[PDB]
């Protein structure tokens, strides 16, 4: 699977966004854009996440 680690907290701006906290491990599901990817959190919730806020895991 493709996983990333949150480098900073992200509160989410649009309703499609996936809010997260620094340290969270997220799984990448799709990359419809270069800097915005769809990911899933440890609870199974899905949403868009900003690439600059994460590092590869």
């Amino acid at each position: 699977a493709e996983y990333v680690r949150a480098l900073f907290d992200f509160n989410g701006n649009d309703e499609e966004d996936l809010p997260f906290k620094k340290g969270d491990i997220l799984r990448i599901r799709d990359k419809p854009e270069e800097q915005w990817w769809n990911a899933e959190d440890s609870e199974g919730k899905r949403g868009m996440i900003p690439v600059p806020y994460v590092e590869k895991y």
């Binding site: 900073f8 907290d9 992200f10 701006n13 649009d14 800097q35 915005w36 900003p50 600059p52 806020y53």
Partner: peptide, 8 residues
């Protein structure tokens, strides 16, 4: 935190 990138 870093700048949140624009959407397209």
């Amino acid at each position: 935190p870093p700048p949140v990138p624009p959407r397209r």
